[model samples]
Target: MLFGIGLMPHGNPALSPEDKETEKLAGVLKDIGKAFSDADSYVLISPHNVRISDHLGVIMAQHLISWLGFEGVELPGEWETDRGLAEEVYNAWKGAEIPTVDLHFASRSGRYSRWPLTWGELIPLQFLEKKPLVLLTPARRLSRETLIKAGEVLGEVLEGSEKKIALIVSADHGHAHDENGPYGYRKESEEYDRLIMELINESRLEELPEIPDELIEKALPDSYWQMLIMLGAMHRVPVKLVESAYACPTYFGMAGALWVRE
Candidate 1:
């Protein structure tokens, strides 16, 4: 019932003509569109938005009016949620009381508001037919155990909804490449990335700890926790690693994954 999507901001740039990297990114976005076709609803998980302690933020309500402005992007809709699915998640989490926030306004160029306004949600939604349940969680300082727990909870919430669902983990990896990259380059960036590539591709997830902090800290991946949590939820569900794309010389250490469940 649940599939997975990785957020590649670069891929969003590919959606329009004015964008320069459309050729490379459009291919990936198109591939993602194809992957998401079967799902009736999506649970878009992103590391952006507020970082809650011991909690995951699941936006509630059907029509949230916040605008997200992307580089060379002009989409038709402002921003919103599929209330039915959003409430389903909110109530499920509230019953569990697992620390949730219905995240509000992400200041685009100059706008402040709430109701699931995120590039991870808005951009990818443009491609998928299903309106997603946008859940925002923090990236740094969150332990792997807690994140995995969050994924497990979400999976349980949607257990028998009858809707074919997909999980879009919105994040980019490794931010230490270009001169403008956030972390600046380090010898460990590629080294750590290689380690993760082999681990995920080989399905040696248990060996995640074998990955060193200094190494991952250098990579600064956006989807590490998201993948780890999904791994927890789908550990029993077979996964086929689809592809790993790297947008090099990017302002941040970045990588994208395309995977499917059998």
Candidate 2:
């Protein structure tokens, strides 16, 4: 059964919780940790982990770990992998004519590649004092529709099994919010995030695809695909927005949202 839905921002925070935005978002991350604490397994979908040039990948190693020191912030952890479930997920997608690779190693090889946990997986993980079986997928170069389908197939397997699964979608919103940042200031950044928040609050997730590419490009929402995957796994089931926080503290527009099946 589906245990919980976690939407996390993959941004490094200030050294201390000196800002309201960081404090609020960190609180949501703790809630995510609590949701994951009791799960039999975890499925972390991120845009920055296990990237493949072509086709999607399902990590199949026995154990996966991370010690990302991005922006000089260190996050370290290790967790077991549910290989059986990983294989099933791979088979489900391939059965649907979607191209996918079964990543069976933690280090790069002729065919396989190393899985490094970036801020996407590291941010939420910081709040957890415990761990569980974990599966990681890097959502790179996959169409929004394909990501949704992948999630649907994964949900099908979890629904039929007795395992409690925690779905973590690690993403950051609108990377162009800061004028001094790489992407520079984009007037649509904050507006795009506002629209995103409104959509979630209205339970209009299916309408997300209707957003224009122009707007999305300017806002640079990395988790839009991950959110779509989460929505597909819900199978259109209703969900409650437990808590949400948003801020454009530095270079990126960071947001955290927690949802629970209703």
Candidate 3:
């Protein structure tokens, strides 16, 4: 059974709780922690971990660590992977004709073999339990439709299972909000973030596939790919929003939203 869905921000500020926005997001994330703790296990769709350009990537490593963060923040201890579910996801993706890549690290050698996590995976996991999880990364080079298709397959494999599984999307919105920041400022950033949240609020995430590519280009959002996959999952297992929050403290936009089955 699919437990629910948790969309959490990946920014470092989500951990520090410096302002009302991040604090609010942190609170919602903590609620997600409570909800997910009861589930048998969870799956995290992260844009930063084990990313494969041409196909979806899954981490099969036995142990995981956080190798990316700000200087002052502490890292989590080594965590174990749910290899059984990870293999299940990989097999299902292959069975569905979706090209899938298996990443084995601290156990096998490849480009991202045993690669440690960045803030993308670290920040979001901080607010959740340390239960066994399968970490998957969206295929960057694949078409949005392909990712969506892959997501649908994931929905089936995950939802059809008897084990309680939670889908946690380690996601963030626009990256071009501050001129002083690396990506610089773009008006499209705000517009994209606003539209994304509105769609989520309305339970119209399926409409996300139609978003213009030009807008996505200008917005510079890491959330797009992961959200596409989420869109497919929701299409398979419908959910309604419980609560959500959005804020931009720096160049990037951070958001926290929770959805449930019933």
Candidate 4:
């Protein structure tokens, strides 16, 4: 019913010089888009909007205005976040017959407005040209169990729905730059990062342990739980994971994707 893809950060100075590795990652991401080309819309769960508040937000009618240069395309509108479950959101957009979109979130209060949909979400979206339904959950505030429940909310949207769907979880792995990256760093940052990647790539999520903030500045681990929820839905669907890669220390991020059939 849904395909899950992980979006990590883009362009690290250490990894930027290696064009071959960059292309390999890009090629894998392009393949992720190809797998869901038929989908009427994509549900992007962005850690960027992982706020500390009640209720979740999704980008509905906003346009992509700022991030045009990265992909070399002119964007049409500014993004605004909306509050809705996935199916209701999908039907509303399909009724209008629009393709190619990016979702942004606005906090319930007038105080928070126009979240950027984050690089974690945007980088993966560049390769796809389909309508999108982006849900920004407060991953940090929500418990692991609550995050799984959020995926169930998405599953509820997909039931009996006509359009094919893909679920994307956008999160960069590890926060290596803390003391230097406006914060500081720890040896544990690299250690835990590798451990998390191994758990994910091996389908051995149970082996993962909760990382503390003292060692790392900030991170979005709930991305893993939502991934588990999506993976459970596609258990027998036969998905193939492309090669995974990482950048250490300076900009600790591990980005990868998986392809699945409905």
Model number with the top TM-score: 3
Alpha-carbon TM-score of each model against the true structure: 0.77, 0.88, 0.94, 0.66
For every candidate, C-alpha RMSD to the true structure in Å: 4.8, 3.1, 2.4, 7.4
Better of 3 and 4 by TM-score: 3
Return whichever of 1 and 2 wins on lDDT.
2
True-vs-predicted CA distance for residue 215, candidate 4, Å: 6.8
- For model 4, residues 4-110, the per-residue Cα lDDT tens digits are 44443443322243555555666666666776777766777655544544344445434332333233433333333333444374453344332213333464335
| Worst 10 contiguous positions by lDDT, candidate 2 | 106-115
Model 3: which residue pairs collide?
Answer: 105-114
Off by over 4 Å in 1: 3-25, 64-66, 70-76, 94-97, 102-116, 130-132, 180-182
- Determine the backbone clash count of candidate 4: 8
Off by over 4 Å in 4: 3-20, 62-116, 177-179, 206-243
Better of 1 and 4 by lDDT: 1
Best prediction by lDDT: 3
lDDT score of residue 107 within candidate 1 = 41
Per-residue lDDT of candidate 3, residues 1-262 (tens digit): 7779999988877877788887887888888888778988889999876677788888888777778765557666666678789899999999988888888755463333455877778888888778888899987678888889988889888898878999999888899999998899999999999999899888788889899999999999999998998888887987779998887888898888889895
lDDT of 1 by residue, 85-182 (tens): 76677676667645566544454223443454556556666666645455556444557766666566677655556777777766665666665555
